[PDB]
Amino acid sequence: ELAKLANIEKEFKNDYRKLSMQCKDFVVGVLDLCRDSEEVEAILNGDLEASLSRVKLAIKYEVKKFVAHPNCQQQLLTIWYENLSGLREQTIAIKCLVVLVVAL
Amino acid sequence: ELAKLANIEKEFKNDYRKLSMQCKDFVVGVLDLCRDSEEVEAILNGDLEASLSRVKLAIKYEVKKFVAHPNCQQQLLTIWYENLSGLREQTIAIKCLVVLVVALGLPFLAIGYWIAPCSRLGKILRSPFMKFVAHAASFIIFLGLLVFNASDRFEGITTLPNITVTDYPKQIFRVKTTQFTWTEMLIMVWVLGMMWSECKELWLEGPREYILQLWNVLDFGMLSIFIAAFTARFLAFLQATKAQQYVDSYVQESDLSEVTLPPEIQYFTYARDKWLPSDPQIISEGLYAIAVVLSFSRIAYILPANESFGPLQISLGRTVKDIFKFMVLFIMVFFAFMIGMFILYSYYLGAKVNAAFTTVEESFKTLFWSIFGLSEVTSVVLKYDHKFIENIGYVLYGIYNVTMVVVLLNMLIAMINSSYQEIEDDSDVEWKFARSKLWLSYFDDNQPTRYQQIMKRLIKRYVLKAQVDKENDEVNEGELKEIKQDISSLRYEL
Amino acid sequence: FGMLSIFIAAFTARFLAFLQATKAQQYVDSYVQESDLSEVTLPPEIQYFTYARDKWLPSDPQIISEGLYAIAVVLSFSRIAYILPANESFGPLQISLGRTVKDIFKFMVLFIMVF
Amino acid sequence: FAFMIGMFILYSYYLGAKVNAAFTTVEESFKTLFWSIFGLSEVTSVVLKYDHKFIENIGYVLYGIYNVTMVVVLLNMLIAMINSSYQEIEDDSDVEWKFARSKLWLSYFDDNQPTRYQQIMKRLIKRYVLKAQVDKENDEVNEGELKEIKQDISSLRYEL
Ligand SMILES: CCCCCC(=O)OC[C@@H](COP(=O)(O)OCCN)OC(=O)CCCCC
Numbered sequence: 051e052l053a054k055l056a057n058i059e060k061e062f063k064n065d066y067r068k069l070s071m072q073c074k075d076f077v078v079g080v081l082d083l084c085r086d087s088e089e090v091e092a093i094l095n096g097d098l099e100a101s102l103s104r105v106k107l108a109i110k111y112e113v114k115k116f117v118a119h120p121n122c123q124q125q126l127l128t129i130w131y132e133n134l135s136g137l138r139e140q141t142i143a144i145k146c147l148v149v150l151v152v153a154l
Numbered sequence: 155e156l157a158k159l160a161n162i163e164k165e166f167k168n169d170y171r172k173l174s175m176q177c178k179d180f181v182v183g184v185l186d187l188c189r190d191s192e193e194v195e196a197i198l199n200g201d202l203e204a205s206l207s208r209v210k211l212a213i214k215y216e217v218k219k220f221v222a223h224p225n226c227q228q229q230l231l232t233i234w235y236e237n238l239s240g241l242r243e244q245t246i247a248i249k250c251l252v253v254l255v256v257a258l259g260l261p262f263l264a265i266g267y268w269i270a271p272c273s274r275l276g277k278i279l280r281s282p283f284m285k286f287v288a289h290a291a292s293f294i295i296f297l298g299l300l301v302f303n304a305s306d307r308f309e310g311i312t313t314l315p316n317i318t319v320t321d322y323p324k325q326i327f328r329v330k331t332t333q334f335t336w337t338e339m340l341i342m343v344w345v346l347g348m349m350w351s352e353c354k355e356l357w358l359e360g361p362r363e364y365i366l367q368l369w370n371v372l373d374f375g376m377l378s379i380f381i382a383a384f385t386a387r388f389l390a391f392l393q394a395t396k397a398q399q400y401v402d403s404y405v406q407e408s409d410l411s412e413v414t415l416p417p418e419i420q421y422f423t424y425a426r427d428k429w430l431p432s433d434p435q436i437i438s439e440g441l442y443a444i445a446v447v448l449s450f451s452r453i454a455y456i457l458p459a460n461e462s463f464g465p466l467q468i469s470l471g472r473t474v475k476d477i478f479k480f481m482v483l484f485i486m487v488f489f490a491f492m493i494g495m496f497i498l499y500s501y502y503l504g505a506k507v508n509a510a511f512t513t514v515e516e517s518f519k520t521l522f523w524s525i526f527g528l529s530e531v532t533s534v535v536l537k538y539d540h541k542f543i544e545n546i547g548y549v550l551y552g553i554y555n556v557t558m559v560v561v562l563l564n565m566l567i568a569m570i571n572s573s574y575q576e577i578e579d580d581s582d583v584e585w586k587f588a589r590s591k592l593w594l595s596y597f598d599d600n601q602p603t604r605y606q607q608i609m610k611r612l613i614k615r616y617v618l619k620a621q622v623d624k625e626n627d628e629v630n631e632g633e634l635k636e637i638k639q640d641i642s643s644l645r646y647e648l
Numbered sequence: 649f650g651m652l653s654i655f656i657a658a659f660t661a662r663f664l665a666f667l668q669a670t671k672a673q674q675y676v677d678s679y680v681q682e683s684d685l686s687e688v689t690l691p692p693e694i695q696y697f698t699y700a701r702d703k704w705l706p707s708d709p710q711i712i713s714e715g716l717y718a719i720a721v722v723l724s725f726s727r728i729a730y731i732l733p734a735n736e737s738f739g740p741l742q743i744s745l746g747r748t749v750k751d752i753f754k755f756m757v758l759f760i761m762v763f
Numbered sequence: 764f765a766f767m768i769g770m771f772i773l774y775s776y777y778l779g780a781k782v783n784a785a786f787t788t789v790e791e792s793f794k795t796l797f798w799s800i801f802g803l804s805e806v807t808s809v810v811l812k813y814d815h816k817f818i819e820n821i822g823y824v825l826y827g828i829y830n831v832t833m834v835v836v837l838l839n840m841l842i843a844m845i846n847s848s849y850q851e852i853e854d855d856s857d858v859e860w861k862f863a864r865s866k867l868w869l870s871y872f873d874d875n876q877p878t879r880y881q882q883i884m885k886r887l888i889k890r891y892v893l894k895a896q897v898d899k900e901n902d903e904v905n906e907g908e909l910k911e912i913k914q915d916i917s918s919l920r921y922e923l
């Protein structure tokens with residue numbers, strides 16, 4: 051809402067953009083404090099009672115530091131390799147062998 | 155350990171790199187506090203009960219500020235001039251006189267070196283600085299031999315290429331062009347020696363050490379190109395000797411131009427107009443022309459031992475190491491436009507103004523030379539009407555000339571980010587970590603101990619300095635807590 | 649979507665070029681009554697499909713096909729931008745390139761006026 | 764110098780049969796490699812009249828490596844020049860320029876009981892010492908008051 055009023059006012063341009071930074075830094079400062087994996091998997095998707103709903107909603111609003119934080123990146127990486135799990139730390143030669151085998 | 159976990163995690167990348175800075179700054183802060191020379195010579199090499207063990211271990215781990223600190227640099231400088239000791243502060247003219255004298259008297263040095271235990275000049279020649287000057291002088295005499303070999307043609311060749319000329323009619327012509335001269339023998343002796351030294355180093359260092367450094371592979375490739383060129387020259391010499399042994403036996407004439415020869419032996423009478431396009435002579439000239447250009451890249455072994463041209467080289471190495479990421483992206487756009495330009499103009503080989511774009515090699519040639527402003531517009535125009543084809547050609551060639559400039563612009567601006575990142579007090583440090591590495595290439599070839607007492611004194615001084623700085627970091631809070639506790643006693647007494 | 653449409657337009661032009669040559673072949677194989685097609689001359693509409701590339705009409709479906717097919721192959725190597733962000737070394741390069749290309753156009757509009 | 768010696772060693776035997784007269788002597792090879800950095804040179808100095816295509820391709824490759832290397836060196840020069848501007852910072856160009864012009868001006872000017880001078884110098888040094896002590900006292904205000912009230916609390920403990 052603040053980031054859309056910034057494009058409609060254009061004279062109080064810097065003030066709404068100064069308030070949107072507080073609205074983003076609150077979320078990043080909450081994200082920092084989580085310790086167990088249950089707290090991370092309670093923040094990144096909402097109340098259930100995958101499906102990464104808050105992350106897919108933070109793409110639309112472009113909150114870059116909420117997605118570029120390590121506590122979200124490790125949760126995305128454990129989905130990006132969700133059955134391979136030994137290729138997660140290998141050389142680029144082993145990765146090129148994979149794409150050559152699949153392309154063949 | 156922290157700097158190796160940083161390359162394996164890659165999500166907690168900044169944290170391990172933040173911890174490695176503390177692990178390095180502890181060592182630098184310990185190094186600061188040493189006062190006598192015994193403490194410096196107790197830190198820089200470990201407990202003995204030269205051999206600079208901690209310095210040689212700080213090269214491997216790349217701790218740049220531990221080697222670029224002055225208390226280590228003075229200890230390395232007192233080894234780098236360990237018998238000269240008056241040359242330590244002299245002008246550059248006196249230093250150039252030294253390298254000129256040693257470059258002149260190079261063949262006297264082995265005669266003076268078998269004497270060396272009986273000579274004070276033998277110990278005065280076995281210092282690291284004299285070894286460095288000797289290797290530099292030998293490599294300069296090598297380039298001098300190449301340029302002098304290239305001599306006698308500096309103002310043109312004297313004849314025409316298709317005309318032959320020999321000492322006598324009997325001599326076959328192909329011998330005189332391929333036989334050896336005295337300077338090429340010295341080149342042959344010199345290349346084998348450098349190949350032998352690199353052969354010894356590869357056997358001891360191992361393949362991983364050779365493969366790890368890009369510079370080692372460049373040197374070894376230059377030596378191999380020299381050897382291949384001389385083998386091609388020798389194969390060219392042998393067949394001419396065989397033809398001369400044929401003619402001098404079975405000639406039975408007055409001149410070799412009088413009676414015609416069998417046609418295999420007839421081929422070795424022709425000038426350069428009629429040689430086969432895969433002649434060993436031609437291959438020899440090509441590879442020998444590549445190797446001479448590659449053999450002036452060896453001055454990078456010399457240049458870091460100088461203050462003025464020192465930090466220049468480091469920035470040049472950084473920019474050359476940072477170009478290749480842009481180069482890989484530029485290859486994709488280049489390949490796209492060359493495949494499109496080849497698919498367009500391939501059917502018009504017979505009817506064009508210029509011979510460009512009609513084959514893949516020529517399209518590669520035109521799109522490569524078009525980025526240096528050395529190309530024509532009139533490669534695009536053709537002879538027939540077909541104006542749709544010609545306008546699509548103009549449009550695609552214009553899009554290419556705009557795209558290369560944009561990519562170039564992006565490269566320059568990204569280069570600026572590195573300078574801002576460099577900030578200050580690092581080029582001086584980085585350059586020092588260059589030259590010391592170069593110096594360490596030549597140095598080679600109950601009741602506690604004294605060492606533990608010295609180390610205990612150093613750690614005690616570090617703890618005391620840290621507590622003094624922590625106490626002076628916050629002065630008011632202790633006094634306020636003390637006067638609050640005093641007000642507690644004043645409330646208890648009143 | 650534009651790259652895909654340019655491909656489809658080029659192949660439709662090629663097919664329109666193929667149909668008329670099939671019509672001329674079905675004419676000649678029916679009404680030829682000769683030994684070779686070079687022997688007896690033809691009606692002049694069917695005669696046109698014997699010429700080489702020197703005498704084609706400047707709006708031939710073949711020429712349009714070659715031009716659009718030459719544009720589409722150049723446009724079809726811009727799809728590697730879907731691949732490149734999944735890599736650490738060529739990752740932050742692309743982003744700066746996208747930023748500079750997005751920032752050129754404001755200068756380009758001002759350059760068009762002077763030009 | 765590296766590229767000119769290589770280009771001279773390559774094309775020296777082909778003086779009679781080339782399109783252009785370039786690279787066939789040291790003076791001419793110097794000329795071509797000097798004017799090639801200002802985009803005032805031809806590709807057709809490399810091509811020759813005979814077949815010998817190995818020689819011609821090595822010529823094209825070395826000339827391309829030269830044209831890339833000069834641009835890289837040039838790029839390095841420009842970026843290193845930027846470091847000096849960042850180092851210059853502010854309040855120095857104005858100062859440096861003044862130290863120019865005054866030098867120019869000084870080229871033309873040419874052709875017991877203490878003295879007055881020592882009284883003036885004594886007054887100046889006294890003012891410098893006083894200003895330094897005032898700035899050092901105002902650099903740390905709270906610590907003297909806390910030490911004074913601690914010493915006053917000592918007397919309050921002695922009296923009570
Ligand atoms: C300009 C190219 C010269 C390359 C080497 C170089 O700069 O070093 C200059 C001195 C060696 O330096 P020092 O150890 O005396 O220290 C220089 C002090 N700034 O002497 C040499 O190392 C020069 C050896 C060359 C003689 C043939």
Ligand SMILES: CCCCCC(=O)OC[C@@H](COP(=O)(O)OCCN)OC(=O)CCCCC
Nearest residue numbers: 145146149150153731732733734735736737738
């Ligand atoms: C250099 C162009 C290659 C484009 C893709 C690319 O860089 O990605 C490299 C890997 C994928 O990366 P990962 O997810 O394994 O992570 C890389 C870790 N730095 O493998 C690929 O995605 C490559 C697929 C191409 C094979 C045909």
Ligand SMILES: CCCCCC(=O)OC[C@@H](CO)OC(=O)CCCCC
Nearest residue numbers: 544545546548549550551552553556
């Ligand atoms: C637009 C229609 C151009 C008509 C074709 C013609 O005859 O020449 C014009 C052509 C050749 O110079 O223009 C260009 O170079 C295109 C540059 C585009 C920049 C993104």
Ligand SMILES: CCCCCC(=O)OC[C@@H](CO)OC(=O)CCCCC
Nearest residue numbers: 515518519522820823824827828831
């Ligand atoms: C690689 C093989 C090239 C074949 C030789 C030929 O016929 O022309 C290609 C040659 C001349 O343009 O290419 C170059 O300019 C080389 C540039 C290299 C950049 C580091």
Ligand SMILES: *[C@@H]1O[C@H](CO)[C@@H](O)[C@H](O)[C@H]1NC(C)=O
Nearest residue numbers: 314315316317318427779780
């Ligand atoms: C050699 O080439 C020159 C070129 O002008 C020509 O005049 C001459 O006749 C040629 N000589 C022979 C022997 O072919």
